[PDB]
Write a protein that binds this ligand. Structure first.
Ligand SMILES: CC[C@H]1CCc2c(sc3nc(SCC(=O)NCCN4CCCCC4)nc(N)c23)C1
Ligand SMILES: CC[C@H]1CCc2c(sc3nc(SCC(=O)NCCN4CCCCC4)nc(N)c23)C1
Ligand SMILES: CC[C@H]1CCc2c(sc3nc(SCC(=O)NCCN4CCCCC4)nc(N)c23)C1
Ligand SMILES: CC[C@H]1CCc2c(sc3nc(SCC(=O)NCCN4CCCCC4)nc(N)c23)C1
Ligand code: NA
Ligand code: NA
Ligand code: NA
Ligand code: NA
Lengths: 396, 396, 396, 396
């Protein structure tokens, strides 16, 4: 078994391994669109002796982090080991080589969506966003007297066909992704793919519709089998007014019993209703995972909470360096030191803290983060907290 | 229809209305235990002309709030309107009279557990704690290398019969409830009731067992019908070591497929495992609801985050007064003013903020909390945040 | 109503009756492939007065029986009576005529797959093979220290596209079918049909993949609706090493929870695992049914167990003749006699014994087989037993 | 942690561990009955330092093996490790000590029912009987013309109350258990327990009824929740006539849709019906597990098939000795040798072969049994086969 960058001859074998490894796999046509985001040396394959028995690659992404800072991000994807070649160290070998290439190329962070929760921790990935499914029984849903957009006169929201308003969705999404931690740039090829998935398929998904506001949109479709459930695939709102107006329109889908959405834990939807309990959490999972590739570059790049006073500490990342960390006026300075560590954690833990989805105090209670100073823990919690709640952009 | 404090003659009619209104009702014997917590003028009844068609009462409780401060709390309970007397304003009349008595008696806060989510908002109750059910597939659960209590030698945890270790459970609970916001004092009569529910009932619940550590306990029983599910009714851990040791023992229930617990959103359990996804959120609901009875008394009583710098604002509670609010060095001063309001919210919203379970920013995004100052919003978020995560003590 | 061999004009009416009688019916295109196996006078139709109200046919098959002996076999199929013409003796009339043609043509045995278990016994068919569905929870599956193909180095098994390795599947199947009782010759037209079913259908089955070893293959696909279940349509292994290697690869389908296969009761799979209970029997049914057309020809053709000493008896088949049966050195001699019968059974019972799937002792306990000699019963059990376990080839 | 025979002081701690380890546990009253079968030194406990954290014992049983031979059998039971003391080698230590005591006491075999399939193999237990659940849709069930007891006149079977016919059940069971491999002696205390379980329990099982024939009985009760399902707990038939007569009566339960029974793979029931498919296999599991304690004593004690000619081989049991094995005229002679092994297997494999439930050929195909001689394999298969099908007596 040898590990190499694939030649054009290797890709049929890679698409066979893909078809056999991923059930949700669209054929090589969607593969062509996504492949445009893979840089020249972004892919590795393992050959037996000879066929493709292992593969992994990364895509060039742009990830928004707290303080509206956009980082170049290596998006790991298309990771598969043939069922014939398990327990042979192929995943470890492929991840070691890609991380080498990612670090050398100058990416401060890598990111992925995990097929399983137990795999990627050991390679330094921490779950960094939380997917929160809300299911609304819209038959009972009444808007609170305080909820915006209740007054008389016309609606700001239009029911439209997605394909006829591409320019407007693109512009709204572009504003959203720059404002929200977890936001990703969505290139033209991924808009091509999204709007192609919007049409009905024979014995497949039903037609997608859009609700369009000047400052937000919702993409939804009736479920394949449950004809009383509308699934919102995507809601991007740049203003509170847009978010409320779009939910008034969704609750107006009078032929549905239930509206479901995969959102974030701080979605204000429940607070828009007279009965907060009607927006039920039906599912919760890790979304985006982060591997901090360069600790000082990552920690210096993001913004920190202004509310917490200037403080200095010494952070050790397990096999990731030891740093003098000074946080004040919403900025961090992170420099090499051999001074005694005040805080220790594995690389994955820093990934989990980085977008503010997990509290240092919570990780400390599980001993994933070690300090003897409870004051320092409070200061880290406050500093790493995100003003704008972290959301998940799109799966890759 | 007249509204009065019940005479001893009224209680048979109240127990009939109870039996017909609450499915989970134990007969008048458990009623006698709980009745010891109802003060002399703590109950109201509505009589038709004559039978009992409405009732409501409060119990004398002690509630822990951020800063380990214990408040006298009126626990509303046993609220019922006969199905014959709906839409007659009986609930509004009974709640108005009890709130009068509660306020006059000098309680700064009232609290309840809501049968429905859409009722109590309009009477000034806000959901203040969050119930989070975790279900662990213990067949896959492996403890992280970092998790405490992994080393060789004896176990700190004992499998015991609850009734034989009452003194130890009482002492552990008493330490827990004083340390954790949401904590309630559990009087002797409620320990009597808890340990009586621990025994098996013919065609009812199975026998309860306890896992006992010097600094924590877990009460659990096998589910009635699902014989591969253990339900943890209660886990009180005063230390991280106790919490981890108890979960090692629960994951050691080798005859079970699943362990479930109703816990809080910041439960560190998922972070103790190599696969965080194995601790699945299977249910989420409002726990304790709070009505702030005296705004200045409540706001001055709790502790605030030390990390946020001193700031001053003007808070208006809708029909609850307007106050100059100054927060610094973890303390609030809250005095009357006619100065222009910088922040406005209904009374229920303040209840939701008060134990730190809901962010001011989230409530602001739904327009439940109104300000023009985004800096002030960040400062409120930070100040009202609880260092120790808010938990739910016991339902009443 | 008249009974005749169909003219080319009759086939549209036969395909309509087929469409209305068989839900799993592919249109006339697959019908054309299978029709090549129907001999010139292999079909009967019943016409009302006039439309097709009844049909039945047989195909020319080659069936492997104990001792690796291959018998010409009439495979009954496409049997239907119009719902308008039930309880009119059409099935009895069509089966009588086909059995006449089959016997006169010189077939020693007829075979079918039964739509229902209660129909074919009365026409002399006995269930002769047993379908055994095993479902493996592959998340727990660990191979026993004794299981072959555990050592270090490369895998003998390749993940491939079925259509690209037709020649290899054909050659492996051809070796398997000649070695295993129940084996059937699979002609080129049925390989055409199998490899056409291997591709995904819109709103239909998912793509089929193959695991290929020099001495075995497995064809599998992810279930339509249960995306955590892989269904093995076919596993043909000529060696124990091939069988184990293919199951190691199937247990390596890490994205699946469950692997299911329709196999035989003696499948060694459970014994390859540390926990035999993980290979759960989820379904059990009659597979191939046999009608012995010529008792002496059938009994003389198959091999018998060498372990049992030479013995002689007199077998009466109900309306099928009486025979002096001498079994020794693994061979039978079966000659006409009027000597007193020592063993009596209906024709269907002999079909059930013939491939070794059912014990004479078991049939005797239900009085389907009558003797007064318990020693003779032990000798029949031993003699008719198959060294190589009976398997089911493909449904027809 | 120390390992000792329990003192009378230890038993409360053992009953607590029992209650917490076994859901199907009846309290100490049934425990007293079963405890009469535990010999003086039949129990071990592990104490921490001090409480009971581990226990295991054996009961004195009598097991019928092929040739109607009755062996003294150590029935392992009540095996539990506290959830606080997992992965501490307590099971290995307790099993090592009990096996020492069992071997020294002169038991040729040990037996158990396994809570899980993956535990007991490594301690030398092989699954030796197969539980086969048949569910009959009795609404369609018609008896075959050949089935016994179809003729006119009175029924041989009586519907009775179990408690009123104890003497008759005892005598029928005693005949059955001496005739059938897997049969166990059922002492008076276990008849006391069985007839106490026959009565209805409030919110528990429904009343048991009996069908009584001179040569067989069936004990059945309507399911707790499925009121159209009758569960046969036990059917013991000494004759084919009794078996058929009892099933005619069970199929006469006209208020039921379904009759279910946990039986053996060779149950002739399906062959009694015109539609064999109506007796559906709904569940299949290992029943009794055997550990051969003394290889020569066990192999010399059982009877072998008379049909197979005399043969000699050399059997090695992994860490269980090497023996010259000569089988002829239905008897084995098994003597020590250092001659080259012709057959090798682990101790557990011999347990699986011993009652004839598993074929040597099947175990060989999984490499659990190793020989280079296919003729020797055929001879072992034939010799170890049981004339009378192996059944499961009662769980312990
Ligand atoms: C040849 C270059 C690669 C780049 C990744 C890639 C494709 S198709 C494609 N489609 C998608 S669909 C969006 C999604 O929900 N992805 C999660 C699951 N994912 C795993 C692997 C791919 C299939 C689904 N995503 C890709 N990364 C890709 C081809
Ligand atoms: C006569 C005085 C009253 C005081 C409240 C009270 C009782 S019994 C009792 N038991 C309980 S059981 C604990 C519990 O989960 N309570 C929620 C539902 N609750 C609603 C009303 C009572 C029944 C169940 N709780 C009470 N407050 C009470 C009698
Ligand atoms: C015109 C000649 C006949 C010969 C039998 C025949 C066809 S299509 C075909 N396909 C099949 S598909 C393989 C299978 O699982 N058969 C069982 C159910 N079977 C019943 C009747 C046909 C449809 C399905 N089988 C045939 N015998 C046939 C046409
Ligand atoms: C104190 C001596 C011991 C002897 C074993 C023993 C008892 S109660 C009892 N009841 C039973 S009930 C029959 C049965 O289905 N047993 C399987 C599960 N079994 C596991 C452990 C006991 C509870 C159920 N069986 C025992 N061996 C025993 C007490
Ligand atoms: Na922003
Ligand atoms: Na505290
Ligand atoms: Na063969
Ligand atoms: Na016998």
């Amino acid at each position: 078994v040898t590990l190499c960058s694939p030649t054009e001859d290797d890709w049929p074998g890679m698409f066979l391994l893909a078809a056999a490894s991923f059930t949700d796999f669209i054929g090589p046509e969607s593969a062509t669109a996504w492949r445009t985001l893979v840089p020249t040396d972004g892919a590795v394959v393992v050959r037996d002796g000879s066929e493709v028995v292992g593969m992994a690659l990364y895509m060039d992404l742009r990830l928004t982090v707290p303080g509206e800072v956009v980082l170049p991000t290596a998006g790991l994807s298309f990771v598969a080991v043939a069922p014939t070649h398990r327990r042979r160290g192929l995943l470890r070998a492929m991840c070691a080589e890609l991380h080498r290439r990612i670090a050398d190329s100058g990416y401060p962070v890598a990111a992925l969506h995990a097929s399983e929760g137990g795999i990627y921790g050991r390679f330094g990935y921490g779950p960094a966003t939380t997917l929160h499914e809300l299911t609304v029984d819209r038959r009972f849903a009444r808007f609170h007297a305080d909820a915006p957009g209740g007054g008389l006169g016309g609606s700001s929201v239009r029911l439209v066909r997605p394909t006829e308003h591409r320019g407007e969705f693109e512009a709204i999404y572009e504003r959203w992704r720059q404002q929200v931690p977890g936001g990703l740039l969505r290139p033209q090829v991924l808009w091509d793919e999204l709007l192609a998935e919007a049409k009905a398929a024979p014995g497949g998904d039903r037609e997608s519709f859009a609700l369009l506001h000047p400052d937000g949109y919702a993409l939804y479709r009736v479920d394949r089998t449950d004809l009383k459930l509308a699934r919102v695939s995507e809601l991007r709102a740049v203003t509170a007014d847009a978010h409320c107006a779009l939910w008034r329109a969704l609750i107006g889908l009078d032929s549905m019993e239930r509206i479901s959405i995969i959102t974030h834990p701080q979605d204000p939807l429940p607070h828009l209703l007279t009965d907060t309990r009607l927006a039920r959490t039906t599912w919760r999972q890790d979304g985006l995972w982060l591997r901090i590739m360069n600790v000082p570059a990552a920690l210096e790049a993001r913004g920190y909470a202004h509310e917490v006073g200037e403080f200095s500490t010494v952070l050790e990342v397990s096999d990731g360096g030891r740093f003098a960390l000074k946080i004040g006026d919403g900025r961090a300075r992170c420099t090499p030191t051999d001074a005694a560590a005040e805080i220790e954690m594995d690389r994955d833990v820093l990934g989990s803290l980085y977008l503010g989805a997990h509290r240092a105090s919570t990780l400390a209670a599980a001993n994933r983060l070690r300090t003897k100073d409870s004051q320092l823990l409070r200061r880290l919690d406050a500093a790493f907290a995100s003003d704008v709640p972290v959301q998940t952009a799109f799966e890759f």
